[PDB]
């Protein structure tokens, strides 16, 4: 084995699995998903004695069931339900990489409302809703509302988080530290406008979000991480095992 030496020993046999996923979305004003997909990777961190033969099992039939469009593995994976079998490197390594497009959980729904007021004002109401278990918290949420180029100033009201009008970036950035599943939040903004060439209307860019959630948007669930070392005297159940899911936004846009 070229990726794992042979005399490794640990008194505390332990492994940590990380399911890191980026969820991407393009949503129309009318609520139709124009496009969506998840890119994920499973990173393993293992401190296991010997030369352990592990078995990684997730919800892959294709309750819980998820379809994987494609995927790639780490050389230690012995290709041929049908699950993954390997003798892992020590420390941290990427066990697998995959893509999903079906039955994706969109953690956030963005509902924008724009009203034009003569030529001097723009009235914007943006509502965000968390689509996930209430016991789970999202963190690092940011909602970004683009403002026209002829913006003389912006007034915003948001009961949750903090918001800042950023003239340089031509946008209103609303930041929220945490937000539990199944909740709603809104921001209101009055965009004061300057005079401009009338003919050239404004091509309204999408409202976009940034967030981090503790579950895999693709629906992936680790079922087991079986450890077997034929020689040494530690069995599967002696191993201390942890899993962590960190699903984050990629391009997550809502057309207004």
């Amino acid at each position: 084995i070229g990726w794992r030496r042979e005399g490794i020993k640990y008194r505390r046999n332990e492994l940590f699995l990380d399911v890191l996923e980026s969820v991407n979305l393009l949503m129309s004003p009318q609520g139709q998903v124009l496009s969506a997909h998840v890119s994920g990777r499973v990173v393993m961190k293992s401190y296991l004695s010997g030369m352990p033969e592990c078995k990684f099992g997730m919800n892959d039939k294709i309750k819980q069931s998820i379809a994987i469009d494609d995927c790639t593995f780490h050389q230690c994976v012995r290709l041929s339900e049908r699950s993954i079998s390997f003798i892992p490197p020590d420390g941290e390594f990427e066990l697998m990489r995959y893509r999903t497009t079906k039955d994706i959980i969109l953690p956030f729904r963005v509902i924008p409302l724009v009203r034009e007021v003569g030529r001097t004002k723009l009235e914007v109401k943006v509502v965000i809703k968390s689509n996930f278990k209430p016991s789970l918290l999202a963190q690092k949420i940011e909602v970004r509302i683009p403002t026209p180029l002829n913006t003389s100033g912006v007034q915003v009201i948001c009961m949750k988080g903090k918001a800042k009008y950023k003239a340089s970036e031509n946008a209103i950035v609303w930041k929220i530290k945490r937000m539990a599943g199944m909740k709603e939040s809104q921001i209101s903004a009055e965009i004061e406008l300057l005079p401009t060439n009338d003919k050239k209307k404004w091509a309204r860019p999408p409202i976009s979000m940034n967030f981090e959630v503790p579950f895999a948007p693709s629906g992936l669930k680790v079922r087991y991480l079986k450890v077997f070392e034929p020689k040494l005297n530690y069995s599967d159940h002696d191993v201390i095992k942890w899993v962590r899911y960190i699903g984050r936004s990629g391009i997550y846009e809502t057309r207004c």
Binding site: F16, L17, P214, Y224, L225, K241, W242, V243, R244
Partner: peptide, 6 residues
């Protein structure tokens, strides 16, 4: 956060 895997 990390969760135990049975």
């Amino acid at each position: 956060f990390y969760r135990a895997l049975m």
